[PDB]
């Protein structure tokens, strides 16, 4: 057992030890809510509770490839809000930057498409954008798959014209991963090597309600500690018909068999400040946030 | 990761089954093994149950077996339940093939997702079976504080009288013990799985799309050396990892890849796949006799 106790304090002590060389961060929409971007599944405020005007059969249909090919209009109307480049990164994002600058970040796997990891200064090599990007777009026809740049797709979205491919007249969509679509090739190539050598999983701002991303927590070695920083416990629940996690694939924070998983419940920004304080990084983190935000405000 | 099959074919499985290494077989079955009996499955286009619920005006097909939707709108399920009641059909060749595995001392367990009871009618006993998605046999009040049990005849009476079954003690809804989405699986599912998959020598997967958890996880619970044979109309368990996939990452079948070492896909009718495997094992005549007499015996009632 690598943690001396199942607390943030225990995780911090482990992080400072020579045994903790490589950290993987797994993040979702929760890490961007304090920047002003709603998550997906939070009641009332979440995106899936705010799609009534689109008259969908159910909320998730707006990001389902099969529904999209039949009724693409709602997604492209919503896309005007989803397009990145008008929010600043959060304290949580800069904490991951700090991990990078301390030589501790093996990888950040993100489910987000807001690009705040990149704006916060994480580089392409540090990142797996697991659910894709707006940066590039592709024709949906597998036979054709013609690629279109951000400007091309952006021009179509903000002109309210449904993007059609110039070669085959099929729909063109941004490379954000829809339900039913394959994840980027980088996800799998990085996963297979990263998870053999990870010393700590830092899971932040995700409900772990979607596969294959939810599987990642179970790819780590059994000895690797896992810290969740989130408003609610995620990944720990009793099995039931239609559960997302595979049997035994979840977190165990609270059973009498718990040995490596720690749930810090609260806001991601505040959890990262608390961890930073325990590591003696709090002033460094605060200075980085202040400087980088002021640098963004400069333009 | 020892390779126990000499070749990734049905003939290689048959040879492995005849060797001394193969002592314990587990069957994992779904609605595909019962369509030839006249019971449609769930997810097949046009024929499947989920494509034939228009009359109930559901938000989506699965709602009719979702516990939250049920409590709020119980009427549609109970209307459908009149059709779901088991005992108007005969078991299939596939069911009798599993019975033959029992009698040959090869069957450790059959885990079924079905509630049609055809495994029992074919001669599999309580001890041989894990009815993973429950049963009509018993019914219970839905209130966690009460859980008052009701017998088969009590639920029938309410269903065919078209009265929504209510608890005589606490007046909460009473439903048959079939597992709805969002509900716990039977205790027996977990207790059996914990021990059964430690020393299983062969997995026989038949007539399922492996589209629901936690049942879909069962193929990953076998040792990495245990061969796995799929007998199904379509390939299931093998797919490129996509957003919203049911299987956990790397928890699927590997039939077609370069690394493929233990998994075999026999594509076609479950009954025909079972007849074919039986022939390779020398049981063809024994299986056909069993099916004839049992069908006759049921008709002879
Ligand atoms: N400030 C905060 N601090 C801590 N936790 C938070 C905060 N805000 C929200 N949360 C928690 O953060 C979590 C947000 O969960 P979800 O909204 O499901 O986002 P995902 O990234 O996991 O969604 C994954 C995919 O699903 C979609 O289909 C898309 O494809 C997504 O990429 C919850 O547990 C909140 O309590
Ligand atoms: N005669 C046949 N021979 C071979 N394969 C067949 C045959 N007929 C159908 N199939 C295949 O059989 C498969 C039928 O798959 P599904 O209809 O999803 O049934 P499940 O048992 O997996 O459903 C699991 C749960 O989901 C529900 O919510 C309930 O809770 C269920 O208990 C397909 O791959 C067919 O191609
Ligand atoms: Zn095209
Ligand atoms: Zn009751």
Author numbering:
A (entry chain A): 57 to 355
B (entry chain B): 55 to 355
What does the paper behind this entry write?
However, we succeeded using conventional screening methods and obtained crystals of both Sirt2 forms in complex with ADPR. The asymmetric unit also contains two very similar monomers (r.m.s.d. of 0.19 Å for all Cα atoms) that adopt the ‘closed’ sirtuin conformation. Additionally, we also provide an improved crystal structure of the Sirt2–ADPR complex.
Sirtuins constitute a family of NAD+-dependent enzymes that catalyse the cleavage of various acyl groups from the ∊-amino group of lysines.
